[PDB]
Amino acid sequence: MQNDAGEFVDLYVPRKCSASNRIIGAKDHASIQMNVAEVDKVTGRFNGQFKTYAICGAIRRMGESDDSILRLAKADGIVSKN
Amino acid sequence: GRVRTKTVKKAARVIIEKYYTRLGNDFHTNKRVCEEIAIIPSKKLRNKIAGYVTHLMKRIQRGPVRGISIKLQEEERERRDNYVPEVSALDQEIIEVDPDTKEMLKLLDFGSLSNLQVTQPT
Amino acid sequence: EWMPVTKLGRLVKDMKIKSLEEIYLFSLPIKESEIIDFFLGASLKDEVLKIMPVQKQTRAGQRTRFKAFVAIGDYNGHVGLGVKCSKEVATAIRGAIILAKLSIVPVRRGYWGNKIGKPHTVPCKVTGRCGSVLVRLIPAPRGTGIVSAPVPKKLLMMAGIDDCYTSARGCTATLGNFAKATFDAISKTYSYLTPDLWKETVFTKSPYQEFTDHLVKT
Amino acid sequence: VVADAGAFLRHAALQDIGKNIYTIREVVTEIRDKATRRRLAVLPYELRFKEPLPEYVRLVTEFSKKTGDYPSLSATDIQVLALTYQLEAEFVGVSHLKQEPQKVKVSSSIQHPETPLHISGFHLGGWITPSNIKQIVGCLTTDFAMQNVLLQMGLHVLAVNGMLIREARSYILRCHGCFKTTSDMSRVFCSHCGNKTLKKVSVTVSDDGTLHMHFSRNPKVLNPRGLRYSLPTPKGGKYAINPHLTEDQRFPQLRLSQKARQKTNVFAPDYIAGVSPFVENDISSRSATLQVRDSTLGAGRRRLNPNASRKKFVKKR
Amino acid sequence: SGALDVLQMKEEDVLKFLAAGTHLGGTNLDFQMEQYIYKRKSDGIYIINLKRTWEKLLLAARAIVAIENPADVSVISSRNTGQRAVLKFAAATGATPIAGRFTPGTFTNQIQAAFREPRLLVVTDPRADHQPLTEASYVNLPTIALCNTDSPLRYVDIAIPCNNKGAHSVGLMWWMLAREVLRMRGTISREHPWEVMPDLYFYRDPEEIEKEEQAA
Amino acid sequence: PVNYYVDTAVRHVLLRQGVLGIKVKIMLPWDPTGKIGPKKPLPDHVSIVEPKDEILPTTPISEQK
RNA sequence: AGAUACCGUCGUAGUUCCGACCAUAAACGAUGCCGACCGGCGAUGCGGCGGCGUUAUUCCCAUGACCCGCCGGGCAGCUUCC
Ligand SMILES: [Zn+2]
């Protein structure tokens, strides 16, 4: 990552999965980047803001990326409790 | 027998797509407008093309066939797609509901709905 | 003059995708070989690893066609591998050259001992598999060179890997298996979480979600 | 005396006593049987062609959903009942009609739905005694969806049986899920909720329209047992077979070969010359190699629950 | 749901799901769907927790919003129950629909004239149109599937527990999906109920055309 | 159209061991002869005039010159 | 064409019981034993736990017989890009 002098010796920083923290590989095509939008707490229109999520493919293979995104938006208050 | 060909079929459908408005139900007027637009070879080919155009006009005047994509018929279709009746079937008085469905909305704080009907459980 | 057929290629062509790296960051597939020619260009070399003749068992005998194992590589950055089977031997080669450009992984380079200067070896001891072919890359001190079979030495050279310790197992004589497996293993260097990579990833705007104003234009 | 396509399908040539015979032009052109067109060639000169009015049609459709038969009727089946409405407003006293008649009055029994309620050779005597096959103003309709709407108005009609109607014994299908009765006996999936939660419901309709319906209170039908099982991956291709969930998901075209799909018409005496005394079995085509079977064949294995003890060497479709 | 009373399931809308019978679930229930259920009852009709169903609509009613070009959404029915909804969905949306047959290779085969590159997929059925799901597994497409109780969540991204075996059951889901995303974007707001009646998005069933032309 | 599109040429080249004989066929294109191809197009090809865009009037305005 | 073989009629030893030998089998899941972890789904066998109901002539509790669910150990399935 960083050499002795401290320059960033790497090409790009690969993004990590937002569910299981694994590296999304560069040739991974079941991968997701779901830009979920934010609401007003009052009006219900579009904020201008949006929360980007990320699902790796092996999670998406298992049918479990539904609950994963579901509890990630629980974690960001986009899903109400119960 | 006498089976048409892709050169007959796939090229006639393009005349439908672009110039449906000038077409009609004649063989002999579809054929005279065919040479106005289709830069064709020999006349047997344009006769088979014009015959498939005429047969296809006959097929259209029942209803839309699969092969077409018409700028005029689809706006006609959307103005026949918009069948908006008086009473939609989601504005009704009595809808019979199982007792196990009833306990959900009492817990999901919508037990105040009066349009329901708990029936005799079978 | 190249006219792309994807939303990817237009943003590549029209100065909107800045580097090759942003395609790797959002893991977008590349379906147009000219994008590879756009960024790499001159800094890209290719090698025929084998031409083998194959025969289709036709009802009237056999007929001859040729496979072509072409590995390409940006020296210091990237590799690829393509396998085209055609009838004409010049056709099978130029098919696999395009087919290898469609298969460009990047590679991560690390250090053996202390991190002085530029990286030279594999960051950890990664492995790869392709059909009973185990291939293991191992980090190596600076200047030891590639200690391998002649075949993965091509891919490791064309990556920019200066030096490595290779160990392999299986029926390595079957070239396609043995060349994909070492292509597998160098593909996994960026697919390996090391403690450098614990910084939480700020998801930047994807160029689809960013430059879609220019995609409504064309 | 309104004539129907079922009266000519059973060939009820009864233009002799009822003499006010009116009919629809469409319901005789839609018949695909040639012996009915043979009936159309000679006899129907005594009847008259007529259509009902759009004021009359909509008022028929009002209590049609209130008797729960409007999707069960065909489109041509709507106009025939409205064709009776102008005749009744013309000839008969309108003052003896009713509409929105009556409730369900569930007569819950311990009788299984599949019991032979009045199937002729079945007996619990009742023989056949070979005369009785022909012993098995108004209308002549053999469709119960037609017959249901008539008697709820209080409209006595007749049939190929020259006497009037008083008893209407048939079966309908109520959705066990959404409580929706259809008069169709052919479909197996629901029309409102689309599940396989249709169950057999026997009715009994009088001439006045006393709807009383034997809902079979028996937990062999009210059963959740063979109802949960894991399903394979959804398969897409020319030869995929998805396990028939909805009434209309696009199955691929799988068809029998016409040299296999046809049986023997062994009744016909033009029969002697040539082949074996049975139909030749199809061992050649790729209809046989893909093991394409009839949708009606093997239906008893559908009724078997999935999680059971199948013998260790079977494989179905 | 984002715990807003602005976004809470309103009192009229509960009636429609009861009316068409979306609360009536299938006979089979996926264990991946067993989170979303309310209860098993007798005779295997797994009644779906509708507030949970309502919470999953709204995440999908946030997912479609962030895309700048609304044409970048593919909306697909493979069967003949969600044809009329999907077509006039995009008429009210600006989406890019696919009705009827999904051409295998619409998302992969870059040579085709049918080849489109969307940014988001919404599916009527994860069993009927499963073919554009596996297509969406290759082009990095997020996914929304109108999931029944028996609906495998494979390659879905968010999923909505409704019923879709019923004709009206499907059409109310698309109508009310479109009802929120438009009021999310900035048309007429939460006060007015929407001018398009959900009977427009019901399936036509052209045996009923001859049952509606002969009376109206 | 094999008789005005392809050009058949047949030779007899010599070597030490015998004779090779080559065959070269050149199927000519369209766009009539600026040394290039024939006048007459393919009798299978059906060129349809591109969809000519026309202005739609709404109000009866009589443009009298 | 060839048969001492594919056939039939009899039929010893054996197949049967008891007492000793004998220790091999395509003795098979062609898959050592014990323990842990790793997806689902119902059916079934045994034991137990709980429960609206129906029948043993109801009923009084019994107790069986079914029916819905749960636990544990079994023989088995089916499913699935673990
Ligand atoms: Zn139903």
Residue numbers in the entry:
A (entry chain V): 1 to 82
B (entry chain R): 2 to 123
C (entry chain C): 59 to 276
D (entry chain y): 7 to 130, 206 to 217, 232 to 412
E (entry chain A): 2 to 217
F (entry chain D): 163 to 227
Paper text:
Hence, the final maturation step releasing functional 40S ribosomal subunits, namely processing of the 18S ribosomal RNA 3′ end, is safeguarded by the protein DIM2, which both interacts with the endoribonuclease NOB1 and masks the rRNA cleavage site. Here, we have used cryo-EM to solve the structures of human pre-40S particles trapped with a catalytically inactive form of RIO1 in this final maturation stage. Image analysis revealed two distinct structural states, prior and after 18S rRNA cleavage. We conclude that states A and B of the pre-40S particles here isolated with RIO1(kd)-StHA correspond to two very late maturation stages, just before and right after cleavage of the 18S rRNA 3′ end.
In the pre-cleavage state, DIM2 and NOB1 are still in place, while the postion of RIO1 is not clearly defined and RPS26 is absent. State A harbored an rRNA scaffold closely resembling that of the mature 18S rRNA. On the head region, the three-way junction formed by rRNA helices h34, h35, and h38 is fully formed, while RPS3, RPS10, and RPS12 occupy their final position. Like in many other pre-40S structures, the upper part of rRNA h44, located on the intersubunit side, appears detached from the body. Low-pass filtering of the cryo-EM map of state A also revealed the presence of TSR1 in this region. On the platform region, the cryo-EM density map allowed to unambiguously position nucleotide A1870, belonging to the ITS1 after the 3′ end of the mature 18S rRNA. In this state, DIM2 protects this region of the 18S-E pre-rRNA and impedes endonucleolytic cleavage by NOB1, located right next to DIM2. These results suggest that RIO1(kd)-StHA pre-40S particles in structural state A are in an immature state in which the rRNA scaffold harbors a quasi-mature conformation, but the remaining nucleotides of the ITS1 have not yet been cleaved off by NOB1. Furthermore, NOB1 and DIM2 are the only two RBFs that can clearly be distinguished, while RIO1(kd)-StHA, the protein used as purification bait, cannot be clearly positioned on this cryo-EM map. The absence of a clear density for RIO1 in pre-cleavage state A suggests that RIO1 is initially flexibly associated, while DIM2 and NOB1 are stably bound.
